[PDB]
Design a protein around this ligand. Structure first.
Ligand SMILES: CC(=O)N1CCc2c(c(Nc3cccc(C(=O)NC(C)C)c3)nn2CC2CC2)C1
Length: 114
């Protein structure tokens, strides 16, 4: 099937907005990780393929996804990176887990519909 950018944005943007609405939990995910600002220069030794909400938002806004599993893949990549890098008891790991819980709840019915 061919998916138009407007269809994807209408269907998928509410699921992205649901992540942004989580406060405080979305705060570490709203911009690309900046290891120098954050004082964690080993970050890219661990995380090879960075992703964050702003990047995903821009891709949706500008029609860069052809089909919805591409969007799902980027959201999951963002979560997977944070679970890999951050320690289990850390704030940012737990914030990731909250976003992932919200995302699965939102995305399941949307993908069923398309
Ligand atoms: C997403 C990710 O894995 N990050 C790496 C770890 C990481 C990231 C961020 N970014 C970030 C950026 C903005 C706000 C926050 C935040 O947690 N604020 C709360 C105290 C409400 C966090 N903070 N940290 C922890 C800092 C290094 C000790 C971003």
């Amino acid at each position: 099937a061919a998916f138009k950018p407007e269809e994807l944005r209408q269907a998928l943007m509410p699921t992205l907005e649901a992540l942004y609405r989580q406060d405080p939990e979305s705060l570490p995910f709203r911009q690309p990780v900046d290891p120098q600002l954050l004082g964690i220069p080993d970050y890219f030794d661990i995380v090879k393929n960075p992703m964050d909400l702003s990047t995903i938002k821009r891709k949706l806004d500008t029609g860069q996804y052809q089909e919805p599993w591409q969007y799902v893949d980027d959201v999951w990549l963002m979560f997977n990176n944070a679970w890999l890098y951050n320690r289990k008891t850390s704030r940012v790991y737990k914030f990731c887990s909250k976003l992932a819980e919200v995302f699965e709840q939102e995305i399941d019915p949307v993908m069923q519909a398309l």
